[PDB]
Every structure is written in structure tokens, then in C-alpha cells.
Amino acid sequence: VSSLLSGLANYTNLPQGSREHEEAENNPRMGTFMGVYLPCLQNIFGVILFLRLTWVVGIAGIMESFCMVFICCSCTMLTAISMSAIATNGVVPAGGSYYMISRSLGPEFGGAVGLCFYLGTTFAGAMYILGTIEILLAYLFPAMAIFKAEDASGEAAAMLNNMRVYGTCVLTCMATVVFVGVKYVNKFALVFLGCVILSILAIYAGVIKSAFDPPNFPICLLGNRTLSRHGFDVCAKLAWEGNETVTTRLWGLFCSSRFLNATCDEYFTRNNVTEIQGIPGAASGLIKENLWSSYLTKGVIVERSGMTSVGLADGTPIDMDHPYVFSDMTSYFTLLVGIYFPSVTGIMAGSNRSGDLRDAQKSIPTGTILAIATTSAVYISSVVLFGACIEGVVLRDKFGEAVNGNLVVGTLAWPSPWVIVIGSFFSTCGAGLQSLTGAPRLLQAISRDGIVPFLQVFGHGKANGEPTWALLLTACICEIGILIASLDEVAPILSMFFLMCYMFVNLACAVQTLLRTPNWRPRFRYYHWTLSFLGMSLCLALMFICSWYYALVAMLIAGLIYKYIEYRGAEKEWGDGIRGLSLSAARYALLRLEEGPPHTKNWRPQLLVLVRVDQDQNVVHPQLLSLTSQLKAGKGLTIVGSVLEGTFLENHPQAQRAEESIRRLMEAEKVKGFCQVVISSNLRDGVSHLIQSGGLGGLQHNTVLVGWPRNWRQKEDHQTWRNFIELVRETTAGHLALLVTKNVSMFPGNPERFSEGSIDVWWIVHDGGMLMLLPFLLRHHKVWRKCKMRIFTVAQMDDNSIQMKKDLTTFLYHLRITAEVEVVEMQSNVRRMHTAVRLNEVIVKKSRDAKLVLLNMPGPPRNRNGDENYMEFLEVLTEHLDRVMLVRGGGREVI
């Protein structure tokens, strides 16, 4: 009991604002029970259980209301799981639910979740304040009212003029008390929870007493219709005062004299007056009867279904139905959902005290889920126990006029009906104070967060971290709810924002799990990404079922703040401008890429090309750029690399020429790529600073496309020829792919197009998925469109049949069967150059005239004295072919 009372000395249900965020940057105990569960359980129980639940039980029945509760509950339990994965991730920063969402989903969604929830909570201030004024005018003080109806038809207008003149009278009282008396209202958090849960138990007490003996609450009927028990007290058409039968006051309101003359309406005279039991209790058979629907229309008299009546009097000449019971408004299914829904909102109060718990990764998930479960078990068992204990004709009655102006709920209370009427009053007064505290701290947090700059003046707090300007704005948005002055119309507008916040909380947690954003570790047990997606579609549907023409103005206001933060998100970090909106998406996509493996399933060539630029700078071989567009036509990353010699301190105007000749040239041949002009000491280094440092992030170059040294055996170019030899060993170590083009100047540019073409591919042993795919990418292009693919295979085994039967089943698996297959078969440098000249005879004698020849490029020797052991081997390999492309690679897979 000791940790109870000491914890009850701590227990306050208020959010932790930015003053509690200051104590987190400068650097007690709680529990699961008084920390999350009891704050959340208070902020869900509200006015709708007491003031408008029984009105929904009788109208929609119990079979449609059970389906109605189970779809409004099931959104909250799924968006608690999306509040759970935010809790398990992160370190749960001290201060509010705003800082828990904003830090774990970035400032992108946090300014939009935090701002829908500001307006959604401010209308919960004005809705509860209309809840208190309605109780004050119907049950507590139904005498005191300024505006009174000047006729029998002014009940529509004078009632709404009551709700405007007391709301604005009390909203100024509510705003000042939370302003000056913050320390007092901090103390009464246990009073308000005591008033609620006793009032809920007082219902469940009296439902058990009514099973054994129901109370005395009779109702009076007149044919099928009932009548207001306001003016008269006794229900009889004739008062039998002994030997003198007297006209009652029931006679007086209908018949236009209190005399025995019988000069009145024919519907009163032909129909008798019946007084039966209005609350027959749990022993009664109501559940088989009161089950389906009673969807009335505004003006229709509420009529008991199963009574014998007399069918006449088509008009309604009863002094505007002076003594009867009516329907206030027309009603249907998808209107009540806007009224029921704010009874299930308050999950975000589950983490008002995250900076005081000790196990915040376990209290915040398990606490709200248990709080939703104990609340939905009340709601569902309230709906049935309202149905099977109370006659439906008073359940269709707002304001309890059929039971002589007492609360429809409060007549089911065992001690007294003044218990719930007072008990729901200090409840709804208290959740009005809480809503004028939880909302001004929130706008205080967003304003000091700097996340949206035009809301900057609302950060001006007072001396103790309490606001002064957000109160005056939240007093003027509660003000708009009070001018509407109608509990049934504030409720769908209020519901439209709390649906919108739970729309985003399910949205961002489903996206960031799928795309694998950085720093996203939902370490929760019972979680998936579809489970946030399923709740995302569900409270998309509820948002239109309320009112579709308000759901579009709710999205496109929230969808425009989400884009307004990003346009200010760019202009702070990325310098300025609409360029920064593209810089950030460039950065954020690259940081996404850092997790996955490179080799995953599939291979595509991503070209690194490197050109030679001479003196009076320009490219020497534009046909090499012309090849690049013929493979990777309007596709992945292209890096046009180039080098030149020495002293960047005075060589950069040459770099300006060198880059600009390439930029206008890629546009000339439709290459969408990126230029790198590097100034090195020798060309040996400057090529190797691009084979390993081209393309940051995941967008690495994957192949290297290079020409051929044509000035091979000449004066000094040997070391430039030696730079080619170090390039081959480099790509094997770095695990790239090499593409070597021979006779570069005679290549098909984009004017020349070929016809009757044949490409001849010689796939001997190695490089399967790259030597096969390279013509298939080329043929795909319009220049190489009208061409033929020929694949010739060298063999070294004995059988060729199964060798072809192994080869012919590759194409069926590759789905590119259109190539024709033909089999062929037959100190250290000479053995290399024995088979060189022999095979090159076999190459030409079946492929003298192709438009392009493909060959395997073998591995260079590790000796490094193999300049002449290996390169005459390749010039014999290029035995006077017109266009041959050499290829080798390492460590890849092609599907």
C-alpha cells in the first residue's frame, strides 16, 4: 500500500512538454500501472459513453452497433501496435508523445502528425465543453437559461442559442484557470479518474440489481406513439376523484379546455393511454426483440413497434405536436460513426509520461494495449447490457424526456440517478481541463522545434516553461466548436483529425519498414509491416465513411504541410532553392543503399568509360562514346572518365576545356552520364583513381569499357602500353568486368545503320552470363536491330552431341534461342602462341565477315615480364578483323 499512496502523490495525468525536454538535454520512478495504463484509461472514457451511447444503441440496434464498435475499436488496437514499434525503436526521449514520433520518423511526418493532433485535441476541448453544458441544462439546472423558446417551434433555435452563450461564458473560465492555476489542476488528476470509474461501476452495479428487481421508471404511451412526461405527472385520461370524475392535466395539454366537454383531437379520443414499465430489466426478453434498426427522420414521432393503434389523422394538428416525443435529426449508419468515434480516442495520452517510466520499451507497448482491451471490453459489454435491459423507445430518446427528464444511463444506477449525473459531470469537466492543457503544450513543442517557421511566435513561453500564446490560439479554435453549438456536429469534425493522425502513424511505419530507412529497428515481439498496412487502409476507409467531402479537405491540408516542411527542410541544409529538394532525395536514396549486398541475383553492365584527350584538347575517339549509347541506351549509370598530366595548381583551365568537350558530346549521341576530369602526375595513377573511386554510395561502376593501344610497338608509348597491362590485373583484383574495343575509329555511329548483319560470338569456357548478354543488349538497339546472332562454341571434350544438348537447353532457359549454334574443336610464350595462330585461323575461316566479333580475353601472367609473352598473343588474336570486342570479368551472376 506504500508504493500506492506515494505513487498517488505522484500521479498526475498531464503531458510532458518542452520544459521536460530541457531536463533531458541538461543530463523519478514509475510503473506500468500508474504510468501508462491509468493515464490512457482516463483519456478514453469521455462524454460519449454517458451522453450519446444509449441513443446509438436503440437507433442502430445491437447487431449493427456491435459491428460498429468492432471496427472503430480495431483501428485503435492496430494503431497502438504502430505506436508500439515507435516505442521499441529509439531510446524513447523524455517529453511527450510528440518527441517519440518526431525523432523516430524524422521531421517529415512529425510536423504533420503533431499538427493534425493539435487540431484534433482542440476540438476535443470544445466537444467536452458542450458535453458539460448539455448536462447543466437538461439535468442539473434546467431552470436557468437566458434564451427560451418564444413558441413551440423555437426549441430548435433556442437550444442552440443556449449552447453558444454558456460555452463562450465557460471557455473564458476554462482558459484562465489553466493559465494561472496550473499547480491546482495538476493535483486533481486522481479526482477525475475517481469520478469516472465509480460511475462505470455504478452502471454495472445497477444492471445486476435490476435483474432481481428492476426500479420504478414507467413510461406513458398513446397508441403506437409515446409522449413527453414533462408537464403532467399522472397518466390517465380521466381523474377519478371519487364520485366526481375530473379531467386530468393530461387532458389539459391535448384538449383545449380543462372541462368535461370533449372538444379535441380525434387521435386522442380514439386511442387509449397505456402506462407500461419503461425499464423491464435483464430478466426481460428485449434482446430477441430490440435487435435490428430504428432509423428515423427529423420530425417523426418515436413510436413503439408492437402496440395496437388506430390509423387516422393524416396531418399533425396538435399545436405543432405540443405534447409529443420527436427525433432531433435524421439518422442513418454512416452518420452515427462520426458520433461514436471520439469515444475511442486517447492513445497518444498513453505516453504522456515517457520521461518518468523506467522500462519505456515495455511499459509503453504493453500499457496502451491493455488499456484498449479493458476499454473495448466495457464498450461492447455496455452495448449489449444497454439493449437487453432497457426498452428501445427510451433508447431512441435524447434528453430522457420519456422518463420524465432523467438520464437514460442514470436510471440504471443502483445507489441513485444523481450519481452518474454528477459523476459524468466532473468527468467531462475534467477532460475539458485536460484538453486545454495537452494541446497548448503541443504547439509549444512544435514552435520551439523550429520545424515550421511561420509558427515561430508561438514558442514565446512564460517564465516557468508554460505557454501564453498557444493558449490564446487554442481558445480561438475551441471557439469555433462552441459556435457550432452541437455535440452531433463537432463529433465528425473532431473525428476527421484523429483519423488523420492515425492514418499517418500507420503510413510512415509501413513505408520505413519496406524501404529500409536508416536507423529503423522495430524491436517488438508481435509486429509486422502488413499489420501497420492493414490498419492504414482501415482508417482510410473510416475517414470517408464519416464524411467524404471533409476527408479530402483533411488530406490535402495535411498533405500540403508535409510538402511545406520539406521545402523548408531543403532551404536550411542544402543552401537554398528547389535544387535542394533534389539534393536531399539524392542523399537519402544513397544512404538507403548502404545495407544490401551487391551481388544479389541479377547483373547489368554499368559502364565506366575512359577516353584519351590530346593537346588542343578534345576527345580522340568519339566512336567509343558512340558505342556506349548502343548498349546502355537511356539506362543506368555512365561515367565518362578522363585524365591529363600534372600540377592541378596550373592545369584547371585545361580541365575546363576537357570537361566541356564531353558534356556537349554526350548530348550529341544521347548519353545520360557523369563526367570526371582528373589531373594526375602520370597516367598510371590517374586511371587507377577512377577504377576504385568512381560513384559514391551504391551506384558503383560495374564494368570498364576501354579502347586499345594502336601505337603499340613505337618510340616511347611502351609505358603507356604498359598502363594497359596494369589495368587488366587491376580489374581482376577489384572484381570488375573489362570490355576492350579493337579498331575504335571504325565503329558504327548513330547516322550509319546496318542491315543483313551478323554478330559472331565465341564462348569457349568462361564468362557465361556476360558473353551471352552483351549482343542481346546490342541487338536491342535500332542500329543493331536488323542483325543476326551467331554463337560458336569451341570444345575440348570427346562428345559433342550432349555438349550441344547441354548448350541447346541453355537458350530455352535464357529465352533467347534466336541465335544459331555451331560446334568447333581441334618457352611458355610459344605454347601460348602455338594455339593462338591455330585458333585464329578457325575464327576467321567461319567468321570473316561479321559486323562485330566477341572473344574471351585470357588472364595476364603474374610474372610481369609477360609484356611480350601475352600481347603478341592478343595481336595474333586480333588477326585483321574489322570490329572485335574483347571481354573478361570476375565474380558475378546473371539471371
Ligand X SMILES: *[C@@H]1O[C@H](CO)[C@@H](O[C@@H]2O[C@H](CO)[C@@H](O)[C@H](O)[C@H]2NC(C)=O)[C@H](O)[C@H]1NC(C)=O
Ligand Y SMILES: *[C@@H]1O[C@H](CO)[C@@H](O)[C@H](O)[C@H]1NC(C)=O
Interface ranges with a copy of itself (CB under 8 A): 25, 514-515, 518, 544, 548-549, 552, 571, 573-579, 582-583, 585-587, 589-593, 596, 600-604, 635-637, 639, 648-650, 652, 655, 672, 674, 676, 678-681, 685-686, 688-690, 692-699, 726, 729-730, 733-734, 782, 785, 895
Q: Is 479 marked as binding a ligand?
A: yes
Q: Give CA 604 to chain center in angstroms.
A: 34
Q: Which option in ligand X, a copy of itself, ligand Y, none does residue 260 bind, with CB closer than 5 to 8 A by kind?
A: ligand Y
CB closer to ligand Y out of 259 and 648: 259
260 binds ligand Y (CB under 6 A): yes
Min dist. Cβ of residue 266 to ligand Y (A):
11
Taking CB under 6 A as the rule, does residue 305 contact ligand X?
A: yes
Q: List beta partners, residue 642.
A: 611, 677
# of chain residues touching ligand Y (CB under 6 A): 6
Please tell me whether residue 240 binds ligand Y under the rule CB under 6 A.
no
- State the Cα torsion 206-211-216-219 to the nearest 10°: 110
* Contact with ligand X (CB under 6 A) among 28, 311, 596, 634: 311
Task: Give the footprint of ligand X on residues 217-236 (CB under 6 A).
Answer: 223-224
Q: Please identify, using beta-carbon distances, which residue of 17 and 223 lies nearer to ligand X.
A: 223
Known binding residue 356? Answer is yes
259, interface contact from ligand X, ligand Y, a copy of itself, none, CB < 5-8 Å by kind: ligand Y
Measured from the CB atom, the residue of 85 and 222 that comes closer to ligand Y is 222
324 is in an annotated binding site: yes
223: alpha, beta or left, given left = phi > 0 and alpha = psi -120 to 50?
A: left
Query: What DSSP character marks residue 604?
Result: -
Say which entry of a copy of itself, ligand Y, ligand X, none residue 305 contacts (CB below 5 to 8 A, set by partner kind): ligand X
Among the listed residues 172, 256, 261, 863, the single contact to ligand Y using CB under 6 A: 261
Q: Is 820 helix (H, G, I), strand (E, B) or coil?
A: strand
Q: Which is nearer to ligand X, 294 or 723 (CB)?
A: 294
What are the helix (H) ranges across 651-779?
652-668, 683-688, 718-734, 768-771, 773-779
Cα(702)–Cα(638) distance, integer angstroms = 10
Contact pick of 184, 259, 292, 648 for ligand Y (by CB under 6 A): 259
The C-alpha atoms of residue 641 and residue 472 are separated, in whole angstroms, by 62
Among the residue ranges 140-148, 266-274, 466-474, 601-609, the one whose residues contact ligand Y (CB under 6 A):
266-274
The minimum distance between CB 576 and a copy of itself, in angstroms, equals: 4
Beta bridge partners of 677: 642
Q: Tell whether 325 is in a known binding site.
A: yes
* CA dist., res. 276 & res. 221, Å (int): 8
Sheet holding 703-706, edge to edge: 674-680, 639-645, 607-611, 703-706, 737-742, 884-889, 852-856, 757-762, 787-795, 820-825
Size of the site for ligand X (CB under 6 A): 7
CB 791 within 8 A of CB 856: no
Tell me if 566 sits within 8 A of 104, measured CB to CB. no
State the minimum distance, in angstroms, from the CB of residue 19 to a copy of itself. 16
Q: How far apart (Å, rounded) are the C-alpha atoms in residues 537 and 530?
A: 10
How far is residue 848's CA from residue 741's CA, in Å, rounded to a whole number? 18
Residue number with CB closer to ligand X (272 or 681): 272
CB of 548 to a copy of itself, least distance (A): 5
**Binding piece for ligand X, criterion CB under 6 A, among 85-93, 302-310, 615-623, 700-708:** 302-310
Q: Is 344 annotated as a binding residue?
A: no
User: Burial of 486 by CB count in 10 Å (0-12 exposed, 13-18 middle, 19+ buried)?
Assistant: middle
Spatial distance between the Cα atoms of 713 and 694, rounded to a whole number of angstroms? 31
Cβ nearer to a copy of itself, comparing 530 with 602: 602
Answer yes or no: is 94 a known binding residue: yes
Residue listed under C-alpha cell 500508474: 34
CA distances from 805 to 792, 801, 823 (A): 14, 6, 12
Check residue 271 for interaction with ligand Y (CB under 6 A): yes
By CB under 6 A, name the one of 169, 260, 310, 590 that touches ligand X. 310
| Least gap, CB of 789 to a copy of itself (angstroms) | 19
Q: 600: Cβ–Cβ under 8 A, 6 or more apart, which residues?
A: none
Pick the binder of ligand X from 20, 134, 303, 449 (CB under 6 A): 303
> Residue 227 CB, nearest distance to ligand Y (Å)?
15
Compute the distance between CA of residue 655 and CA of residue 356 in angstroms, rounded to an integer. 61
User: Known binding site for chloride: residues?
Assistant: 94, 324-325, 479
Binding residues for K(+): 320, 356
- Binding residues vs ligand X (CB under 6 A): 223-224, 303, 305, 309-311
